[PDB]
Structures are given as structure tokens and as C-alpha cells.
Amino acid sequence: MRPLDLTEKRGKKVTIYFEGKELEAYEGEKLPVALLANEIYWLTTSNEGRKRGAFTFGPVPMTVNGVKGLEARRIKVKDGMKIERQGYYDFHEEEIERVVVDVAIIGGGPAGIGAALELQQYLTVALIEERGWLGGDMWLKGIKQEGFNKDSRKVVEELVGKLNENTKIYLETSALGVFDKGEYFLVPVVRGDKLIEILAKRVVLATGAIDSTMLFENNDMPGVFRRDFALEVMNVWEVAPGRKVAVTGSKADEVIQELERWGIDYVHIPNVKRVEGNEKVERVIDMNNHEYKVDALIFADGRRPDINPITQAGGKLRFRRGYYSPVLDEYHRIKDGIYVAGSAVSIKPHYANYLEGKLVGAYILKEFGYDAQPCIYEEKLREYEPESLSIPRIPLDKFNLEDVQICGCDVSLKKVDEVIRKGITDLQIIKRLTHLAMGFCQGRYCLFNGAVVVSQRTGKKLSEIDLPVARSPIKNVKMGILAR
Amino acid sequence: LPEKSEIVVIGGGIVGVTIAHELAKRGEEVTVIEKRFIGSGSTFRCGTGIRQQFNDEANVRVMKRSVELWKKYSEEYGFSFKQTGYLFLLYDDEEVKTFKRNIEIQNKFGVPTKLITPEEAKEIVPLLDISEVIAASWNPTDGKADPFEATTAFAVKAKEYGAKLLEYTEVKGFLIENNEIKGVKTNKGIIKTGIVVNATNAWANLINAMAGIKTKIPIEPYKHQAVITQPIKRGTINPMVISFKYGHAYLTQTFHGGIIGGIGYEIGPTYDLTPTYEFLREVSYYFTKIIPALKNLLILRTWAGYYAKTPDSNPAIGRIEELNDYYIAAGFSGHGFMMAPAVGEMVAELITKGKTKLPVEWYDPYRFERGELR
Amino acid sequence: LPEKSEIVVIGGGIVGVTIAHELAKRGEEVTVIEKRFIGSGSTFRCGTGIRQQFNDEANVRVMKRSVELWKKYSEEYGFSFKQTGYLFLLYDDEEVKTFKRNIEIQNKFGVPTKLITPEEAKEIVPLLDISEVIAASWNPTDGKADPFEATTAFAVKAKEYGAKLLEYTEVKGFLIENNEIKGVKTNKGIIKTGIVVNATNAWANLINAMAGIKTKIPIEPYKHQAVITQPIKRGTINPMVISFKYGHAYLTQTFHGGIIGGIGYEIGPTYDLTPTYEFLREVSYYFTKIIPALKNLLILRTWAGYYAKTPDSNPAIGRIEELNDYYIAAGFSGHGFMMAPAVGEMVAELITKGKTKLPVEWYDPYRFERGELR
């Protein structure tokens, strides 16, 4: 057992080296998780000298066997592996498959599975998921779940269990976007390092929501965990974020329930001002200047639909219930032939998103001439009012602005605030002046916040501040993979 | 919103503001009218300029001059223009002969371009794959600059010198009395003026239409595209590297560290932006042929913008005689950012003296109907 | 819906049905699978064929043969194929020399084309403006036919001879065991077969994709367009008149009396139909240059259709070896209607004997990866 193991691992034991030090890991574990288990948090430094971990926004470039600039999260641990830290900008110096399919479902959470289950009654589908497992956010929980009155992870197993050979599953697979060729849609997809082109008649974006990022002082430092990452390490791998854990944000109960299940000690800090520490977090300070000693901070401030795949697919947005949503016709369509389902549509219980996927799959099944009954899913859905999110009042005056990070790359809240103060309110321009939303997330974890700041400094309402649209490759792909 | 103005420049991109800028520092009173923000449009989607390696006297003289103005204003207003060179990679005797010939004409007019060696080309840009390059055209006084940074700079100076820059203000029509311009009709009232300049390149036709110009000045918007990679160590790729053989690829590194670039891949006369999968594939193929290390680099985003094309890839810059005090500076066909400082100077002189130091007549608005393509 | 079939032809356009037709009259059992109706698709949007004036031996021999089959089947099934000729108008020595050379090769292989005089060209087609035509290429055994009429005819005979023609039936996949085809998966069940023919020209890639064919066979759909005028006295314009100089214009009169035609104006790889204003303007300009009387004629409608283009404007017709009993006959690049009777014959013989009388190897599916363009 390593110090942060929640279980004794029974996988094949393996040995790796971090900065020369000999560490034990298990086969199949991903680099940052093996290092966490061994109490190692600080994995890289940004170009302007900011220490960083793997469990919040931003990329983790690491030298993995003399090969510079590999992404830590993507790398499985391997016996004899030589791992080292490096600069942010340090790079290394040194057979297309075509598959035709009826629908192409992007995203493998409850919505995606839902759609696939409905669809494979008669059609051939691609279920595309970049994640390596086929649950959704649901596979991150293991707490009993409403709707299917049954344990979160047990439901996923049941559902995956029910998939046909009519469903081609694509794990560890990144969709690069959707391209309408009139007669079909092209969804180019990357798995391992092969490019696969999926030509489909229909598409469904079952694309999910992403966790909102909280603005407080060293919010990027090692040992801060965004909700999803904390749940992943605890529930998927079985590793604690730390020995004693601070928890914050408006959905902190979801996290606390997991902590309690695993018996991980914690404090609940409703309003975080700052985190401090040399390599990692060791104190958090609240808005009343109270300090708490802890090894990690976990924040959970609500999920918001990931709008990138929507807007690259050519969909339009609406602001409602504290977040941006897809504008849909009466059939959950973004545009003719592209359906949207799940937490991509709105925030609501897993079961609801599951139904919406079935709903969306049923419409296309009806399109195809099969006798489906989308409305039974429709009427089940209405039983679930979509959730709201409070819009954050960022106490700008009360923060030391250069310490609070807005995006992954450079980009402090101060830089953004500065340009707004000089009159610029158009996010298009803000994007260019500061590098907000130009980093390796494409604004996923910062655009909305940038908007909130403009809105706050301006008085201009959020339902009027329109968002820069997502462009060509919605996910990072390198570049060799795309020739010839 | 002013209600009278001696001169009205339509369009507030690099060209529009750069023209205003010259007129204003020359003591003249100018207001620019931009329908969105200063520097939106192609200038906002633009690569990083700036080149003197052209193939005819006029363009070479204009760009020589232009580069002098880039040096001057760059340091004088503090906006940053690195002279890292332009590097044309050559692969066969066909190309070598042609460039030997281009360089010759460049030299005559004071642009000291050299034909160089593969290993020399690889000293500059160490990551260049040199295996099938047989020579390269090199000029160390070509460079790159951020079109947005540079436009905003010229903009605040133009205002300082007394120009009015009107932002969410669209031109919709003209008050034309006899053949006199009397006013420019907008979405926010009419402005009285006798002299107007059309600097809306991709939109030039629209402005020409509103003015009732009957002279054929064919300027079509075409969709060109660009890619940006993840940031990389500073000074990894310094000059603009061009490869005609590999799909009219151009690539260089941004000041942020990016490595930006595009290829020839043109999409027929359209106002559509929105990038395409086919461009994504092609740029990846071409770039990685030219510098192989790019294979290990993440692509972050892709975008599109207009080339405002004419049949001979040269702008239309001149006085239109049949409308009284109508000028055009539009249709820069992909290289209008680099020209801007110089065309500013030219247009100012036209307005102001009736003739120009530089050979502005190469860009004659009337050449097309007359059948005289360059 | 059958459940087994010796041969399955995918696509029920002129090419698809014409192939089935040969196989069936040869005693073989064929079922065609068409996703809409027999002859929808390009055949439905097609001009009126049919020409032997090509510039290389294979095409000239194939079309000579093809025309023999048009004569035979035309009268034998009663579907009407008027041999009114094709008339290529020439305007300069450049063109004359080139056509002198084309005709020469045409003649060698039994296509008796003549180079003719302006006044001769004007006897045929009295309304031709002859003022700048210096010669014309004329062959009196080229003609025109209605692609829909002709397809439906071949269709009902193919059925008579025992072919199954399946109409609202789309191919979606293939059951491939080893490298054996076992079945063609459709929207209405699977059909067992060991031999399949891909005749879906514009869609060819899709079918190739479903089959897992890894050989590069580049076939792109391009938007071409046509116009129809109001009906006019019978026999006013009898031959197909071609003018390369005036925008690759082709025009002729329909059996209804229409005067149908298009021009070169191609719109980049797309599946979009829907006509354009720019085509409307251009066709009007070109036609009225070639025959001035057209100026007084009402345009009624305009439409669009696919050319299924390859890099060398020749189809891919052959056996694909790595899939067991996969054939392709697709990519006719604008002249696939006229070829159909002959390609039917060729494909039948391939399936049936393993080789063909005609030079089918010119249309080698493998030529493109091998780098060998025609």
C-alpha cells in the first residue's frame, strides 16, 4: 500500500522512476494517479513559473523516457519508466480507416448509452468516447442514484452489459468535430494514434457538461482538485486526493458523501479566498481570513453543458438557468440531422439524461421508418425540472488578482480585468489581448468566467454577452496523425 | 457621430486606419467609419505579413518603402515588428531559374535578396528538413508583426493626431448630388463630406454599388484558412517559411510561441467563414513534409478569413473620376496587411497633392475594363 | 426482396441498369439495388449524350462500339436515338491544330470525323453565328437521346430477361467473411451474394467505404448545371454544338423542342444541388455569343447535377482483387451516359469471361495509386 491508496491494489505490480526516485505503481494506472498515490502532486511548471498538478485545468507536459512533451494524463505507467519534469513548451524533436454507420453517437455517458440502446434495435451506431470507460460522469460516483434506484456504477455495468454487436464502441477515442457533407456527416475520430473517419447518416451529441472552475487565489496550484478529478481518483482508481481534505463550492455535498464513504477526513469551507504551499497545498484561507491545514482542496461549483461540440456542429446558444444551452427545435435538434441529448442539453439527474438519449434515439429511429415511441420518453422527461446555477459574484476588489487564474495558459484574472478596465468588453477582443480561451482547453474552463467578469464590471446582462464559437478540431490532435 | 467631415474613410481595418493615420498626421481631417470594431475583418484573421520579395518593380518598390515605414512606426509607437526574414524553399531547376530571375528584379530596386544554400537555409530554422531543398530565396529584412497589435497602435495615434474613428457605424448609402458626393448615409445618420475612400476590401463591391460606380472592379471574397499549434520554445521558427512545391504552405512562429500558418487551398467566391476538415488534413500533410518535428505537435484551433481577390492578384488603388472625390484602396489578394503603411502614404498623397512618389498607377482601378491585367 | 443473388449491382442509373441488362440477357442472374427510383440521380439530370469525338484510342473505340449499341437497342426496344451529329466550333490555329490531331486519332479507329468549313457548319444549324468560327469538327454519327427514356427501356428489358430491380432499397453495408463477400446489407434485410458491382458514381466512395476498399479511388461529386429554354420549331438546332472558347458551352434542342445546355462552370467538391444566379448569367452570355437568336428566347428553368470526377476525367472500371468479387464502374466525369451501353458490355464480359473485347484496362481502378493518370 502506498500512502494515498484507498485499497490494496491487486493488479500486476510495476516500478517507475520520478526525478530519479524509485516508486511503485500498478499496471494500467495512469501516470498522474500513480504519482498521486505516492504523494507526488507537482508535475509541471507553466512558462511564467507557476507550479501545477493534474487535477484542475491545464495540460501536463512531461518527459517520459527522454521523450519531451508527452501528456501525463494520457500515459499509462510501464515497468522501468523514467519520468521527469520539464518546461511547458519543451517538445520532442522526432493507414486511415473508413467506417460507415447509421448514427455516430459522440459521448459515452448515460445519454450516449441511452441513445445506443434505443438505436441498436435496428440501426448500426458508433458510440464514441475519449474516456477509456463507458460510464459517464456516472462512473465517477458509486452512490445510490435516483431514477434507476440502484448504485451508480452498478447501473453502468448493467447498461453497457446490454449493448449489441450493432454498437461499435470506441473507447479512448476523441472526436474532432462534425462536418456536414449533405448526404452524410463526417465525424473524424482519433484513437491511439490512428485516425478513423466515421461517415454517418445521423449524429447525436451526447457530449456532457463540464465542471465549472472557481475563481480564488492559487486555484491552479498542485493539490487542487476539480470535482470530476477528485471523484475519478477516489472511485475509478482507488486513491485519496490527500490525507485531510478541504471541500468547497455549491455542490460540495456530492463530494462530501464520497469522502465519508471512503472515510477520508475533511473540512467544509463555504467560501475560499486562497490556497498556499510550496510544492503543494498546505493551508486554505477563507474570506474571513481563517486558516485550515489540509493536503488538498476539492471544489464543486456545478457543471455546465460543454458548448464546444454544439457550436462547431453549427448549433446556436441560449442563456437560461445560469448557463448556456443549445437552442433546439421541437425534436432536440441543433440543425437537421444532428441531435443533442443529456447534460449537453441541460443539467438534471443521470436518469433524465439517460431518457433524453433514448428520446433522441427514438426520433431518429422514427426518421428511419421504424415504429418508435419517442413521446413515452418525452413525458418521463418532464418529471425532471432542469437545475439552475447561481451566477458567481467574484469579489474582485477583495482578491489579489494576479494570483487568481482564469485560464490554463498564462492568463491571470488581473490581465482580463485590466483590459476590461481599459474599455474593452467584446470577448472576441479580450480573447486576443489576453490569451483567454486560446489555451489547450479552447475556453471550456474559462470562457463563461470571462463573460461573468465583463458582465460584472459592465452591468451588461449575461443573456446579451455572446460567446466566441468553437472551431475546427474541438479536441487537440497532433498533427502527424492527420497526414496523409 | 460627427455631421461634417472633410474626408470619410470607409472601413477600419489595417488599410482603413493606416490611411486615416497618414491623412491626420498630415494635418487633414479624417473620420473612419467601421461597421464592427477597428481591426475586425481580415486584419483580425490575418497572418503575420511582411515581405518585399515580389516579382515586379512596383510591388517591390512599394514594399521596400512599406518596410521602411514598418521599422519607423514599429519603434516610434512601440508595437513590435521583428525582422526575422522570409525564406522561400526551392526544389528544382524550374523554380531556381524563376527565382534567380525574381531576385534579380528585387535587387535592382534595393531589396537585397540572396539565393541561398540548403545548409544555409537550415542554419536559420534548424528544424527544416533539407533533403529535397536545392536552394532557397532568403531576405533578412522581411519580417512579421501582429496585425491586431499594429492596427490598434496606428488607430490610437490617428485619434491623437485628430482623426475620428467611428466603431459600430455601418455605411448604407451615399448622398450624391450631381456627380458630387455630398454625404455618406449610415445606420446612425448622414455625414456630410465631399471626399470618400473605400477601404473595405472584401466588401468593396457593396460600397461601389452604393456609390453607383459603373466601372468593373472585380473583387471577390475567397475563403482562405489558417492553423495554430501549441506554443513551443521561443525562436524555434523565426522567419516566414514558404514552400510553393508543398501546396503554397506558409508557416512561422507567433510572438506567443504558436506556429501559425496556412496553405493555398482556396474556396470559391464566398462570404462563408467556418473551417473545413479537408484543410485540416492538407495543412497537416504539407507542414510535416516541410518541418517533420511538427508531427509531434498538437493542433489547437483552425480558422478562416477573406482574401479579397482581383483577377491579377493586385489591389485597386486610385481615384475614381466619374464620382467626385471617390477613391478606392481594396482587393489586396492576401498580402494587403504588409502593404498598408505604404498604401496609406500613397492614398494620402493622392488626396493631398494629386500624385505619389511611389508607382501607384500599377494598381489602376481602370486596368480591368481596359483589359490590362498585371 | 430476394435473399440470394448470384450478382448484385448497386445503383440503378443508366450505368447500373445497362450492366444488369447485359448480364441478364447473357443468362446470368442479377439484381440491382437502387436507393430511390430507377434513373434518379445524375441520369435524371443528364444532358442528351452521345459522342465518339474523344482524344485517345480507348475512349474512341469504346464510344464507336457504344454508338453501335445505341443504334441496335434504340430501334430494337423503340426508345429513340437521333444521329444528328456533334459540332465542335473552332476559332483559332491553336484549336485547329489540336483538333486536326484529335480527328486523326478518331479516324484511325473508325470514327469518320471531318474537319469542316464555317459555311458548312452553318448549313447544319442555320442560326449559328459564323463570324469568328474558322473551322468546326463535325461527325454525323454522334447523336442525342433522352437519358430517362433510355434507362427505363433498358430497365423493363432487363426485367423481361429476368433481372430483379429493387427500388426503394439502400445499401448500407457488406457481410465480408474472409476476403469473401457474403452478403449485401440493406435497409430492408441482407442479400446473399459473392459478386457485387459498384455503380453509384457520385456515391462510389460511400460504397467503397462500406466495402473496406483500401485502394485510393478518388471520385468527387461536383456541381454542374443546365438551362432549358421555351420550346421552338422542331429541328432548329439538331446536333450538339460545342464551343470550348465560349466557356465549354454545349447546347442542343430536345425532342420536346427545348434547347437544353450548360457550360464548364464547376462548383467545388459538393453534394449540394440548387442552381446559382452566376450560372444563369454566364450561360446566357455564352449561348447568345454562339447562336444570337437565343437572345429573344425565354429561359424557363435551371437545374443541377453531379459530375462524378476523377483526376484524369476517366472512370474506374475494373475488378478489385483484394475483395472477392468486387467490381467498380464509376466516375464518368460528365460523359458516363453515352458510355453506358459499352461499359455494360465490358463489365458483363469481365464478370463472365475474365477479359473484354474493348480496351477496358485504360479505366484501371489501380491507376491512381500507381501514379498513372491518363
Ligand SMILES: Cc1cc2nc3c(=O)[nH]c(=O)nc-3n(C[C@H](O)[C@H](O)[C@H](O)COP(=O)(O)OP(=O)(O)OC[C@H]3O[C@@H](n4cnc5c(N)ncnc54)[C@H](O)[C@@H]3O)c2cc1C
Ligand atoms: C488567413 C489569412 C492570412 C493572411 N495573412 C497575411 C499576411 O501574412 N500578410 C499580409 O500582408 N496579409 C495577409 N492576409 C490578408 C490581410 O488580412 C488583408 O490583405 C488585410 O486585412 C486587408 O486589410 P483591409 O483593411 O483592406 O481589410 P479588412 O481588414 O477586412 O477591413 C475592411 C473593413 O471594412 C469594414 N466594412 C465593410 N463594410 C462596411 C460598411 N458598409 N460600413 C463600414 N465598414 C464596413 C469591415 O467591417 C472591415 O473591418 C491574410 C488574410 C487571411 C484571411
Ligand SMILES: Cc1cc2nc3c(=O)[nH]c(=O)nc-3n(C[C@H](O)[C@H](O)[C@H](O)COP(=O)(O)OP(=O)(O)OC[C@H]3O[C@@H](n4cnc5c(N)ncnc54)[C@H](O)[C@@H]3O)c2cc1C
Ligand atoms: C447537367 C448534366 C449534364 C450531363 N450531360 C451528359 C451528356 O450529355 N452525356 C453524357 O454521357 N453524360 C452526361 N452527364 C453525366 C451523366 O449523367 C452521368 O455520367 C451518368 O448519369 C452516370 O450514370 P450512373 O448510373 O453511373 O450514375 P447515376 O445516374 O447517379 O446512378 C447512380 C445511382 O446509384 C444510387 N445509389 C447511390 N448510393 C446508393 C446506395 N447506398 N444504395 C443503393 N443505391 C445507391 C443513386 O440513387 C443513383 O441513382 C451529365 C451530367 C450532368 C449533371
Ligand SMILES: Cc1cc2nc3c(=O)[nH]c(=O)nc-3n(C[C@H](O)[C@H](O)C(O)COP(=O)(O)O)c2cc1C
Ligand atoms: C495572429 C493570430 C494568432 C492566433 N492565435 C491563436 C491561438 O494562439 N490560439 C487559438 O485558439 N486561436 C488563435 N487564433 C485564432 C483566433 O481564435 C481567431 O481570431 C479566430 O479564430 C477567428 O474567430 P472565429 O474562429 O470565431 O471565426 C489566432 C489568430 C490570429 C490571426
Ligand SMILES: Nc1ncnc2c1ncn2[C@@H]1O[C@H](COP(=O)(O)OP(=O)(O)OP(=O)(O)O)[C@@H](O)[C@H]1O
Ligand atoms: N469530442 C469528444 N470525443 C469523445 N468523447 C467526448 C467528446 N466530448 C465529450 N465527450 C464525452 O462525452 C461524455 C459525456 O457524458 P456525461 O456523463 O458527462 O453526460 P451525459 O451522458 O449527458 O449524462 P450525465 O451528465 O448525467 O452523466 C464524457 O464521457 C466525455 O468524455
Ligand SMILES: [Cl-]
Ligand atoms: Cl486580401
Ligand SMILES: [Cl-]
Ligand atoms: Cl459523371
Ligand SMILES: [Fe+3]
Ligand atoms: Fe484555454
